[PDB]
Amino acid sequence: TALQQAFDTSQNNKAAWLQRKNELAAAEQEYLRLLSGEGRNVSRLDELRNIIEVRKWQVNQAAGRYIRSHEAVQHISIRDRLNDFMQQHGTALAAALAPELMGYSELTAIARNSAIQRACDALREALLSWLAKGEKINYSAQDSDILTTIGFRPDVASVDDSREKFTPAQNMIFSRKSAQLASRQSV
Amino acid sequence: TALQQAFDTSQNNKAAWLQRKNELAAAEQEYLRLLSGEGRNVSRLDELRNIIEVRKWQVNQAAGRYIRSHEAVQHISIRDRLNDFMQQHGTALAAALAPELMGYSELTAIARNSAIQRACDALREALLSWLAKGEKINYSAQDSDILTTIGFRPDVASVDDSREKFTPAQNMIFSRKSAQLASRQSV
Numbered sequence: 001t002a003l004q005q006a007f008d009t010s011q012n013n014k015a016a017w018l019q020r021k022n023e024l025a026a027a028e029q030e031y032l033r034l035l036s037g038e039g040r041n042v043s044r045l046d047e048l049r050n051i052i053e054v055r056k057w058q059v060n061q062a063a064g065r066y067i068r069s070h071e072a073v074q075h076i077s078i079r080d081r082l083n084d085f086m087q088q089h090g091t092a093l094a095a096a097l098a099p100e101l102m103g104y105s106e107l108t109a110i111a112r113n114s115a116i117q118r119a120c121d122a123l124r125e126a127l128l129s130w131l132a133k134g135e136k137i138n139y140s141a142q143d144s145d146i147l148t149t150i151g152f153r154p155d156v157a158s159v160d161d162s163r164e165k166f167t168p169a170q171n172m173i174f175s176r177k178s179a180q181l182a183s184r185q186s187v
Numbered sequence: 188t189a190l191q192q193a194f195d196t197s198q199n200n201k202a203a204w205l206q207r208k209n210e211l212a213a214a215e216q217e218y219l220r221l222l223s224g225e226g227r228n229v230s231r232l233d234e235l236r237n238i239i240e241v242r243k244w245q246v247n248q249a250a251g252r253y254i255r256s257h258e259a260v261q262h263i264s265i266r267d268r269l270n271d272f273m274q275q276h277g278t279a280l281a282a283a284l285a286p287e288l289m290g291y292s293e294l295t296a297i298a299r300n301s302a303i304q305r306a307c308d309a310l311r312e313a314l315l316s317w318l319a320k321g322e323k324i325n326y327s328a329q330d331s332d333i334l335t336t337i338g339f340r341p342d343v344a345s346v347d348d349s350r351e352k353f354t355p356a357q358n359m360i361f362s363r364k365s366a367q368l369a370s371r372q373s374v
């Protein structure tokens with residue numbers, strides 16, 4: 001299913017974001033090792049300078065991509081779980097909303113926009129009212145393992161790491177550089 | 188209960204709206220009887236002229252008041268039916284929305300506005316999806332008799348009759364006149 005894929009792609013993008021962070025550290029630490037040293041390798045430093053810059057962009061891009069893939073997993077679960085609920089109790093629910101919804105298939109586009117808006121307001125109130133009970137919410141059994149595993153939200157670290165913006169111009173430059181940085185044989 | 192009262196007040200306001208319409212007709216028909224006649228009762232005609240005017244306002248005011256009382260009955264049913272549904276399946280429903288809702292009691296006001304908006308969007312989609320099945324919607328068993336009885340909507344006659352607007356100024360004049368028209372002993 002799409003949710004299994006979406007999950008896999010997520011934990012993957014997380015792992016990727018964390019790798020990039022590692023690599024940035026690795027570079028940063030080598031830069032610092034060098035400046036603390038007595039030699040004066042102008043060129044190694046200027047290439048480490050560039051590498052560090054690239055890795056920061058990479059940490060940024062990876063973080064964003066991770067957040068969205070996280071959200072996706074949630075988005076998909078909600079969707080399917082809700083559908084499985086409509087499957088179960090969709091008749092009971094539309095019955096309760098019958099004064100708004102009855103003859104919906106029969107409605108015009110302005111009738112149908114109206115009807116849904118007003119039903120969705122009534123549903124908003126009902127949900128809030130049930131919330132105020134303070135009953136504790138657990139994930140749907142079916143997707144609990146996945147949803148727990150990915151976490152409730154992305155650690156704010158990723159939100160922070162993705163905060164900065166990059167033009168598609170920069171993205172082009174940097175993606176080229178990343179690809180060059182990819183092929184590099186260490187020596 | 189409030190719904191039983193609301194219903195009673197409705198069919199009442201309908202009956203009232205229809206009475207006023209009758210009375211207007213009665214007056215109108217007497218006016219016409221007179222103009223078709225040979226005599227020339229200047230004064231009866233000018234008092235029938237005023238009565239007709241009042242009755243039109245009354246038909247207008249009664250119609251509006253009826254519409255809103257109708258809506259009210261529906262509004263209340265929806266509310267209670269939904270609550271009875273949340274009672275039943277509120278746990279299943281919040282579970283499905285757990286990625287949005289989990290830790291709602293814990294949320295800030297901006298967190299809580301956000302969370303509900305997004306849940307209510309997911310619920311909008313789910314409902315629409317279930318609608319598209321084209322399954323036929325019946326009133327909740329518990330309120331079926333009432334809801335059927337009052338009708339799905341007010342006949343458009345009432346919408347038409349209430350169409351015109353009246354300032355609170357006019358309303359004062361006319362309500363005075365209606366009260367004078369009330370005490371009149373026919374002779």
